[PDB]
């Protein structure tokens, strides 16, 4: 019948953009009924901002309600729990989805950056790889930059956080780069955004194609 | 009611161990009925080997049939399709799950191996990272070796295949290693097993902690 999902603010949104938001999605396979309410609240009792709202009846007959709530970074850091409560249809119990900052010890990531040896054929392209590890909570964002301008997201792929043997998480990120970029200027930064990185929630490493 | 899954032979099993097997799993949430048949066949008509079989009624009331079929590597390479057919309960249509070698062009992986700079605290540990890329079909196995003996699986983690921009796949693998290992002998191999690697379906790169 009804499924509901709520996302986490990305670290990039908490600490860089600094306008973080969370998104509550409801998927109702049989909208046989009237309105499906969906309501935000905070565990503390404090008020929430207004949220966007959007409904689509989908071609297969499913109804799809999305809602987006802006949250405070400071509130998020102090422990707020944000809650999306789904209400009405043939639901005895309401559904409720929630998100809060992860428990446990904190620990800034270590970043390492590596370049690929020239491969026959490629010549005009090179591969950069960034290993980011030992960070605690696994929440993390990753940017690559060049001429102190952040590259587009889709230029790189980053893997999902997995647990290291022992404690903390790691993550790999990969960016192909072109001769026109590296001769332009032979420096690329791999930057992680993480709540425990401290002055300002980031750690970065520079890497170069040649020596 | 009834779900069914069938796995793919790992490349490590096709090309190294050389006794590859596939596993057909049925999960039936309401075993209200009698026997659930599960039957192997090949798309070509040719006979199959005998398979292991195992049933467990689970505590939550689910019934769980697993079956394991040995297959030929040469048969697999020539295009066989293996099929697990699930039969009986309140199923009008039978279910059928299948597995076959992936379509399209082939291309051996490129392996690159990197070591981590000393990190304060660690000292007695170092991190190795292997980038494996541009391979086609995404099916791949990864071993790390030391003193020409393959390390245990759980010593390393490897990521899921993702598509590079353009063509082919990549994969990262990570292995922590200890001072006792690298002073013992400072060479570790990262080995990929892949159908297109040709003499013998493998490509490897050596890496060292110091220079």
């Amino acid at each position, epitope marked *: 019948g009804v499924s509901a*999902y*709520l*996302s*986490r603010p990305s670290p990039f949104d908490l600490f860089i953009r600094k306008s973080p938001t*969370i998104t509550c999605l409801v998927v109702d396979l049989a909208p046989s009924k009237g309105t499906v309410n969906l309501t935000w609240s905070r565990a503390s009792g404090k008020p929430v901002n207004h949220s966007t709202r959007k409904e689509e009846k989908q071609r297969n007959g499913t109804l799809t309600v999305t809602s987006t709530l802006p949250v405070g970074t400071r509130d998020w850091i102090e422990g707020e*729990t944000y*809650q999306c409560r789904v209400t009405h249809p043939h639901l005895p*119990r*309401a*559904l*409720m*989805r*929630s*998100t*809060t900052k*992860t*428990s*446990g010890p904190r620990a800034a990531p270590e970043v390492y950056a590596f370049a690929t040896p020239e491969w026959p054929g490629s010549r005009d392209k090179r591969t950069l790889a960034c290993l980011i590890q030992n960070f605690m909570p696994e929440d993390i964002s990753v940017q690559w930059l060049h001429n102190e301008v952040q590259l587009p997201d889709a230029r790189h792929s980053t893997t999902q956080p997995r647990k290291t043997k022992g*404690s903390g998480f790691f993550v790999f990120s990969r960016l192909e780069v072109t001769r026109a970029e590296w001769e332009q200027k032979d420096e690329f930064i791999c930057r992680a955004v993480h709540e425990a990185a401290s002055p300002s929630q980031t750690v970065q490493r520079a890497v170069s194609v040649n020596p | 009611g009834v779900s069914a899954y069938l796995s793919r032979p790992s490349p490590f099993d096709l090309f190294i161990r050389k006794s590859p097997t596939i596993t057909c799993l049925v999960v039936d949430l309401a075993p209200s009925k009698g026997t659930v048949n599960l039957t192997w066949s090949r798309a070509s008509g040719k006979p199959v080997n005998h398979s292991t079989r195992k049933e*467990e*009624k*689970q*505590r*939550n*009331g689910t019934l*769980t049939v697993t079956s394991t079929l040995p297959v030929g590597t040469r048969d697999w390479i020539e295009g066989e399709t293996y099929q697990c057919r699930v039969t009986h309960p309140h199923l009008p249509r039978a279910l059928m799950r299948s597995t076959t070698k992936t379509s399209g062009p082939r291309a051996a992986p490129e392996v690159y191996a990197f070591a981590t700079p000393e990190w304060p605290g660690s000292r007695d540990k170092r991190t190795l990272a292997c980038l494996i890329q541009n391979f086609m079909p995404e099916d791949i196995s990864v071993q790390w070796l030391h003193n020409e003996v393959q390390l245990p699986d759980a010593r390393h983690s490897t990521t899921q295949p993702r598509k590079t921009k353009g063509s082919g796949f990549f994969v990262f693998s990570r292995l922590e290693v200890t001072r006792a290992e690298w002073e013992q002998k400072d060479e570790f191999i990262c080995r990929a097993v892949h159908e297109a690697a040709s003499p013998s379906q493998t490509v490897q790169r050596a890496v060292s902690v110091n220079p």
Partner: antibody
Amino acid sequence: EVQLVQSGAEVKKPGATVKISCKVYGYIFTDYNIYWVRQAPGKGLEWMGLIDPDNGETFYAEKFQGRATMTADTSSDRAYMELSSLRFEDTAVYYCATVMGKWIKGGYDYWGRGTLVTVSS
Amino acid sequence: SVLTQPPSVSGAPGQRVTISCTGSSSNIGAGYDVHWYQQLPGTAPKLLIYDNFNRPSGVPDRFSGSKSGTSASLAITGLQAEDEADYYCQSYDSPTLTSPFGTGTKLTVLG
């Protein structure tokens, strides 16, 4: 493979609060109640309470009312237990457990490894 | 309500030993299922019996459960060194809405 992964050991001063975590893999976190069970060193199992992840509702045995708070972070597949006003006697291993049933009373099938909580001056 | 078990019980390998679990008419006596758990030193409990007499996937058949009136009983035939563990029963207790564990029994294997 279904797994209840519990957090590491915690060491607290009397009067403190600790939040230990039970992270779920292998089914839909929000489908089934999670139960929490306490075990003081050398002593028997005690059933503390249960939470329903789909909606946040909880229930506690009398003894733990007030000083245990069960929560669930659905966005991250994580059932939390929060112990407060910690006392020496609150030193125990705390387990989370479950059964993929719904509508069934006991016989927990899947168990975390336990989180030890040690309270000392 | 407490579900009470004898604090301890004794073995001698290959022999058959029983553990009992006694409640009242508001739990076991009330038609509610009994279950059993086994705990080895330093490990989490494992479920051995559920719904009175059922074994979960992988438990040897030498373990059996029965439920009499207000009591239920675990029986281990062919006692083995490895059976040396703590055992707890559990049932539902409607006056409290809880599902308490029994006081627990320490199995000791003789010899």
